[PDB]
């Protein structure tokens, strides 16, 4: 639950474009036209996941082997979670 | 690059089954028959990735909204990386 303000501009301005698009795909606020993302833009840490590489000694056909197995963690894509409004300026 | 021994048994024994199967699917050690995973079974941390939830103030159709956007991180599946041998007992 750690928080962090990120400065506006390119990245956040494309988060707003993203947010408006995916909202229009449900559409039941009508058809919205993206304008701008204003301060403050907040970033909450909701998880920390570790990727692992297992190293095993394995008997197969009663021969011994060294196998390495990854359990990689993937940064997936952006998904719009909530979209409510209108709201007062912060 | 942090290391950790994990005790053998169910989980590691299924990592060895996994490792032998996915090896047979390239097959060019022939056809191997899984027997057992022995100590020590090692676990290396190869990454730490955080999932995020962005909270934005967005003007759309000159109305202000509160949008929340997740950038979830996914624990993907196991992939056999390397498989060499035979080797001496450790």
Residue numbers in the entry:
A (entry chain A), B (entry chain A): 2 to 91
Manuscript text:
Here, we engineer the hydrophobic QVVAG hinge loop from the domain-swapping cystatin, stefin B, individually into the β-turn-β motifs of the single chain variant of the sweet protein monellin (MNEI). In domain swapping, two protein molecules exchange “domains” or structural units connected by a hinge loop, such that intermolecular interactions replace the intramolecular interactions at the dimer interface of each monomer. We show that introducing the QVVAG motif into three different surface loops of MNEI results in domain-swapped dimerization, generating topologically-distinct domain-swapped dimers of MNEI. We then show that engineering the QVVAG stretch simultaneously into two different loops of MNEI creates two swappable domains in it, resulting in the formation of a double domain-swapped dimer.
The QVVAG segment was next introduced simultaneously into two different loops of MNEI, with the aim of designing two swappable domains in it. L13MN was crystallized, and its structure was determined by X-ray crystallography to a resolution of 2.3 Å. The atomic structure of L13MN revealed a domain-swapped dimer, which was constructed by a novel criss-crossed arrangement of the two polypeptide chains contributing to the dimer. Both loop1 and loop3 acted as hinge loops, and adopted an extended conformation in the dimer. Swapping via loop1 results in an exchange of β1-α1-loopA-β2 and β3-loop2-β4-loop3-β5 sub-domains. Additional swapping via loop3 splits the β3-loop2-β4-loop3-β5 sub-domain further into β3-loop2-β4 and β5 sub-domains. This results in a reciprocal exchange of more than one sub-domain between the two L13MN polypeptide chains, forming a dimer where the β3-loop2-β4 hairpin from one polypeptide chain appears to have “inserted” into the neighboring polypeptide chain. L13MN is the first instance of a designed double domain-swapped protein. The parallel arrangement of the two subunits in the L13MN dimer results in the stacking of four QVVAG stretches, generating a small hydrophobic patch at their interface. The number of contacts (including van der Waals contacts and hydrogen bonds) observed at the secondary interface in L1MN is 15, whereas the same in L13MN is 66, indicating significantly higher integration in L13MN.
